[PDB]
């Protein structure tokens, strides 16, 4: 009965996620830990041409009033599909190999992913909605498509003060502070949402506490108010019927959001430290993560093959 | 636990699927109708019209293939939302196969694969969707649960054109090139399920598409559409990311149970044939004691809100 440890490193761009993941992997034996990198080659060439350049280019032309919100939404929506494809297809092929949740002995294999499918199907789309370039209905359609949450889904989010974050970003994409704020807010909201659900929060019971505007710990702390969760973003006029509550189609999508996030294992990594400091901190966090059994005898080698294949073909 | 019979009425538009499903249920049989209100108002404004106008603009050379594909892509997300959200919430209620009449019969107007696979594939055949986008939607197809019975149609082309002309939805343009494409995709779909059920291995047969248990040839299945040059490396090999999506397609389609309804007849004749087809469909148990009444509620609420 070989066990597997899956860890998805996620959160806003520019905090040091990629470095620290590589550093952690460099500490292990090549055969017992494998890095699933960002699929940059899929994004710039294989799925479409220079998808990142197109997203940045679209938000800029919308911001400058050169294209309409509608024109922006179509490009952003199609672009996000391209951005999420390698994550969704990897999740789908991995799925059959994942058994139940297995502290416990060291895992036979550890897979560290640079992001989870919810980055492209939920977080970046929600931030683009805040930026005016995605409709809330399209964000909810993406949510309804998030794959069932496999057992042992450990997600590591990141903490980094805005000023240090902004500092790192003056490195070269395009320098969008509003987008940085939006993606930090969405990942904030996501950590609070997982805690709200894990504390027994029912969005349907608390929906009425939202009426207002905009004024995190994913696995500690008291229960957050629904106003500090992702459910706050969907009180948009577009989604409300003439009686005032959400149309049922959108309510069901929120039911799906709850189901998917409630069973996840979320951890917060302080990135306000040197690269080796982030590496250790993540390594200490990796000890409280949930492992799973695998379903077949050869699932370990198959999974390892999948991960190396992915890295070779799609990472730079 | 009580048993459930799920029946997805699908296939090319213009065949009379909605006419014949109306008649079928015209409290132990509930209909999840075509979510026309989502398409025209709730999800976006007149998405049908936007899809047919875009293809028309592309056919006339007013917009580029790239401009069309972005619109078709974004619009297929809108079209499929009602199906995807319905499947996501119904999923936890479906238990294993049960194999006497079911406690509930849920008849749907289409399955999620219409919007995540068949319409995208037809638009690729129409030059208005990239094959990479079709495989992105394929990777997102929900896992096939037990008892997924899908009814596809059979109808001669000329008769289908006649019926298509009467069944025009709001914003639709009569397009015989799209009719041919959607008829080709659904025919390929039926052959693909048979291919996979008789043990066909797309990876083993792939060379037959380029290097020259009775089952259809692979060139007569959906896999042939994915020999698209955009998905291949300079040496001709398919990129693994796309091969994986084809592995997902094989997994999702193989376990669906396909039934063919002859539409070349009257609405009562079509309705009657549909009912004859139900004896071979697979029923499942539900997972909770309360699964039945809540599924019924889902179905009525969907209908009331999104049905025309
Ligand atoms: C995952 C994801 C990323 N991105 C961009 C922002 C980020 O800085 C990046 C590297 O992660 C360049 C690519 C999106 O726009 N959408 C997405 O779904
Ligand atoms: C399911 C589906 C339908 N359609 C159109 C064709 C059809 O005739 C219709 C009603 O069934 C108008 C809507 C698409 O364009 N994409 C789709 O995924």
Swiss-Prot record, chain A:
What does the annotation say about its assembly with partners?
Homodimer.
Which SUPFAM superfamilies does the protein's record reference? P-loop containing nucleoside triphosphate hydrolases
Biotechnology usage: Used in molecular biology as a selectable marker to identify transfected eukaryotic cells. Used in cancer suicide gene therapy to selectively kill transformed cells.
- Tell me which residues bind ATP: 11-18, 168
The entry's protein name is: Thymidine kinase
Quote the record's miscellaneous comment: Phosphorylates and thereby activates certain drugs like acyclovir (ACV), valacyclovir, and famciclovir to a toxic form, that leads to successful suppression of the infection, while the uninfected cell does not have this ability because it lacks TK. Mutations in thymidine kinase may induce HSV resistance to antiviral therapies in immunocompromised patients. The most frequently observed resistant strains are unable to express TK and are avirulent in animal models of disease.
Disulfide bond positions: none
From Swiss-Prot, chain B:
Q: Which InterPro entries match?
A: Herpes_TK, P-loop_NTPase
As its record notes, the protein acts as a catalyst of:
thymidine + ATP = dTMP + ADP + H(+)
Where, by residue number, does ATP bind?
Answer: 11-18, 163
According to its UniProt entry, this protein's organism is: Human herpesvirus 1 (strain 17) (HHV-1)
**Which parts of the sequence bind substrate?**
52, 76, 169
Lineage: superkingdom: Viruses
Sorted UniProt keywords: ATP-binding, DNA synthesis, Early protein, Kinase, Nucleotide-binding, Transferase
Q: Which residues form the active site?
A: 34
Its gene is TK
What Enzyme Commission number(s) apply to this enzyme?
A: 2.7.1.21
- Additional remarks: Phosphorylates and thereby activates certain drugs like acyclovir (ACV), valacyclovir, and famciclovir to a toxic form, that leads to successful suppression of the infection, while the uninfected cell does not have this ability because it lacks TK. Mutations in thymidine kinase may induce HSV resistance to antiviral therapies in immunocompromised patients. The most frequently observed resistant strains are unable to express TK and are avirulent in animal models of disease.
How would you summarize this protein's biotechnological applications?
Used in molecular biology as a selectable marker to identify transfected eukaryotic cells. Used in cancer suicide gene therapy to selectively kill transformed cells.
Which protein is depicted?
A: Thymidine kinase
Similarity section: Belongs to the herpesviridae thymidine kinase family.
The free-text function statement in the UniProt record for this protein reads: Catalyzes the transfer of the gamma-phospho group of ATP to thymidine to generate dTMP in the salvage pathway of pyrimidine synthesis. The dTMP serves as a substrate for DNA polymerase during viral DNA replication. Allows the virus to be reactivated and to grow in non-proliferative cells lacking a high concentration of phosphorylated nucleic acid precursors.
- Give the GO molecular function terms: ATP binding; thymidine kinase activity
Question: Which EC main class describes this enzyme?
Answer: transferase
